[PDB]
Design brief:
monomer; little secondary structure; immune system; structure from cyana 2.1; monomeric
Length: 13
């Protein structure tokens, strides 16, 4: 359960 491939640059970790 996710639904967020995140194509553009955006993944703060």
């Amino acid at each position: 359960l996710g639904q967020q491939q995140a194509f553009p640059p955006q993944q703060p970790y």
